[PDB]
């Protein structure tokens, strides 16, 4: 029960400076955004698989396990997608810039009163970004209301016994609501709790950004539409 | 019943909710590697057998042989990615995708 | 036990960076000279002394290198465990009462490559885990060794090449202190992968202090260490 | 002589068990022959300092051979840095709590 994508144009990488992929356990990506972003502006694996007419409907979804015990992780489906990973009914967002599965994102409204995002911003749908992120400044309001504090490279932690009294945090996609509970948005490490929630300044013509990485997607089963330009979301189940 | 295909599910492995790689196959017959089904990025690449010395990550991954492929074709060109983390350069080739591994 | 009264200390009220995070102790307990305490404050092993603590003035440290031993390392007070090493203590002179500052006559790489060829001056030192010398010093014995740089200083060896290897003697007080490849090479397991690190590291220390090689926990692991304080010394003995 | 049982954390950090203070206070010290003092983490520590967060803290009103000092003290190590304050006290080695 599998695909061939015949004829397919990919790098052989000889020369991968520093940590990050020796850490990795992974041996490579498979990218799957709009080929807009791609290096040597190659077709791309599901462009090409598009192209060889290998699916009847040209979608992809993720559904990610938010527990690493959990068998499977997570699952990839190829030309549709699972019910049986998904609540309810998917509601689509239209994609704004086919280069990231781009969306326009109305408001981050935090439970406790604050309102990041308030005129509206742009994100993108990033499955390769376990973490959200977010505008430097943006972000760091977001930890002072959450009582976090910094560490390094834009990350924040919180104290656990205060992870039970945080407050929730909604992002609301398309006229919807989209809630994360502190248990959603906060990862246990080592006994320390991260918060899901990262400052980064992406530059522009691209940023400002925000990235709804795997914190998101691992409560919101995504729907990756290719004929009709859109991301569809659900309650994951 | 008798149906038709359907579609296609890649199962997905993940470590602590901090990476979800899959299976996947290059060649012919398919040579396993995990690759992160990235919807942030629009390019494939694996780590080449003919990888300099330097490059550490290469030691511990599996590489590709395009000398144990049939449906191997030759581009050549040079290729740099850059990642919101990180960085790679390599080489352009073309061969058979398979998902998954198949092999 | 041994109760050190009247002991001056610090209460670290900033730690930052991430070192510290990451760390499984709580704190340093220094037992260097007096020279190097920060604001003058006489050390727990200076106090232990005046205050007649112990019979003998000296202090021993075996390393388990498994390191899934059971204890996987014994600091003895006033004394030496002789259950943990083999054969009889050589000493050397300390130079410099700082560190424990010895003088190291050579660095040599049984392949060929001699380094430290006109003597330099090393300390043994028990916070540091691996061997550290001059960076082009350093550079020259991984390039010796066909280890290749990682990042800060730090050389990776390909698993497959570490039986190959050739051993790297230390000469200190004449007698030759030899390591083989599995003695200075770290088989570092994570995320279900294995790397061999390299137990040598290139860092300049910088004058008057530095140039200065560190005999690091690599070293104290295959060799059992005692600190004379009252001969100025440091005794080396096979550890067992 | 008094031996003090070291615990091994993969072959790179060397540290055993020591007291601070009348009952004594166990905290893991490295013994650190590279550097000439000593240091565990207060409980009048930042709330900045993550690393106190997990990490056994002195506290000075529990003791009873307690002393005072309040010198400011910076230690500079290759690695990292901390700052804090003076003290004295009973140093218990092993904990002997
Ligand atoms: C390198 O591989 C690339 C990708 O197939 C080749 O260039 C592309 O060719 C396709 C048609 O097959 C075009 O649609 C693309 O637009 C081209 N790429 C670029 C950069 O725009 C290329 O010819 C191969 N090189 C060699 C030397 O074989
Ligand atoms: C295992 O964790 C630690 C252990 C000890 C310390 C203190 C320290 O820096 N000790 C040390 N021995 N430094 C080496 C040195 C370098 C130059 C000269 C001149 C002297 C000595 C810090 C640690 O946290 C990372
Ligand atoms: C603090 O301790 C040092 C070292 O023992 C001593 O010289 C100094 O006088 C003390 N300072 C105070 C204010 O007690």
Same mark, same amino acid.
């Given at each position: 029960?599998?695909?061939?994508?015949?004829?397919?144009?990919?790098?052989?990488?000889?020369?991968?400076?520093?940590?990050?992929?020796?850490?990795?356990?992974?041996?490579?990506?498979?990218?799957?955004?709009?080929?807009?972003?791609?290096?040597?502006?190659?077709?791309?694996?599901?462009?090409?698989?598009?192209?060889?007419?290998?699916?009847?409907?040209?979608?992809?979804?993720?559904?990610?396990?938010?527990?690493?015990?959990?068998?499977?992780?997570?699952?990839?489906?190829?030309?549709?997608?699972?019910?049986?990973?998904?609540?309810?009914?998917?509601?689509?967002?239209?994609?704004?810039?086919?280069?990231?599965?781009?969306?326009?994102?109305?408001?981050?409204?935090?439970?406790?009163?604050?309102?990041?995002?308030?005129?509206?911003?742009?994100?993108?749908?990033?499955?390769?970004?376990?973490?959200?992120?977010?505008?430097?400044?943006?972000?760091?309001?977001?930890?002072?209301?959450?009582?976090?504090?910094?560490?390094?490279?834009?990350?924040?932690?919180?104290?656990?016994?205060?992870?039970?009294?945080?407050?929730?945090?909604?992002?609301?996609?398309?006229?919807?609501?989209?809630?994360?509970?502190?248990?959603?948005?906060?990862?246990?490490?080592?006994?320390?709790?991260?918060?899901?929630?990262?400052?980064?300044?992406?530059?522009?013509?691209?940023?400002?950004?925000?990235?709804?990485?795997?914190?998101?997607?691992?409560?919101?089963?995504?729907?990756?539409?290719?004929?009709?330009?859109?991301?569809?979301?659900?309650?994951?189940? | 019943?008798?149906?038709?295909?359907?579609?296609?599910?890649?199962?997905?492995?993940?470590?602590?909710?901090?990476?979800?790689?899959?299976?996947?196959?290059?060649?012919?017959?398919?040579?396993?590697?995990?690759?992160?089904?990235?919807?942030?990025?629009?390019?494939?690449?694996?780590?080449?057998?003919?990888?300099?010395?330097?490059?550490?990550?290469?030691?511990?991954?599996?590489? =590709?042989? /395009?000398?144990?492929? *049939?449906? &191997?074709?030759?581009?050549? $060109?040079?290729?740099?990615?850059? =990642?919101? /983390?990180?960085?790679? *350069?390599? &080489?352009?080739?073309?061969? $058979?995708?398979?998902?998954?591994?198949?092999?």
């Amino acid at each position: 029960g599998g695909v061939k994508v015949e004829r397919q144009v990919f790098g052989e990488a000889t020369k991968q400076p520093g940590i990050t992929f020796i850490a990795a356990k992974f041996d490579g990506i498979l990218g799957m955004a709009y080929p807009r972003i791609s290096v040597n502006n190659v077709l791309p694996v599901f462009d090409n698989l598009m192209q060889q007419k290998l699916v009847d409907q040209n979608i992809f979804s993720f559904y990610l396990s938010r527990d690493p015990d959990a068998q499977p992780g997570g699952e990839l489906m190829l030309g549709g997608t699972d019910s049986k990973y998904y609540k309810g009914s998917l509601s689509y967002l239209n994609v704004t810039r086919k280069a990231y599965w781009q969306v326009h994102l109305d408001q981050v409204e935090v439970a406790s009163g604050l309102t990041l995002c308030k005129e509206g911003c742009e994100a993108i749908v990033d499955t390769g970004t376990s973490l959200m992120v977010g505008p430097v400044d943006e972000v760091r309001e977001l930890q002072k209301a959450i009582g976090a504090v910094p560490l390094i490279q834009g990350e924040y932690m919180i104290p656990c016994e205060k992870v039970s009294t945080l407050p929730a945090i909604t992002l609301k996609l398309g006229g919807k609501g989209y809630k994360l509970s502190p248990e959603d948005y906060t990862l246990k490490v080592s006994t320390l709790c991260l918060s899901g929630f990262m400052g980064m300044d992406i530059p522009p013509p691209s940023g400002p950004l925000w990235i709804l990485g795997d914190v998101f997607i691992g409560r919101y089963y995504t729907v990756f539409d290719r004929d009709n330009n859109r991301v569809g979301f659900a309650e994951a189940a | 019943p008798a149906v038709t295909e359907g579609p296609i599910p890649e199962v997905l492995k993940n470590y602590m909710d901090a990476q979800y790689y899959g299976e996947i196959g290059i060649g012919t017959p398919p040579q396993c590697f995990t690759v992160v089904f990235d919807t942030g990025s629009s390019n494939l690449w694996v780590p080449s057998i003919h990888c300099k010395l330097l490059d550490i990550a290469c030691w511990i991954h599996h590489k =590709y042989n /395009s000398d144990k492929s *049939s449906t &191997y074709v030759k581009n050549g $060109t040079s290729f740099d990615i850059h =990642y919101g /983390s990180g960085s790679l *350069s390599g &080489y352009l080739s073309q061969d $058979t995708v398979s998902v998954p591994c198949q092999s």
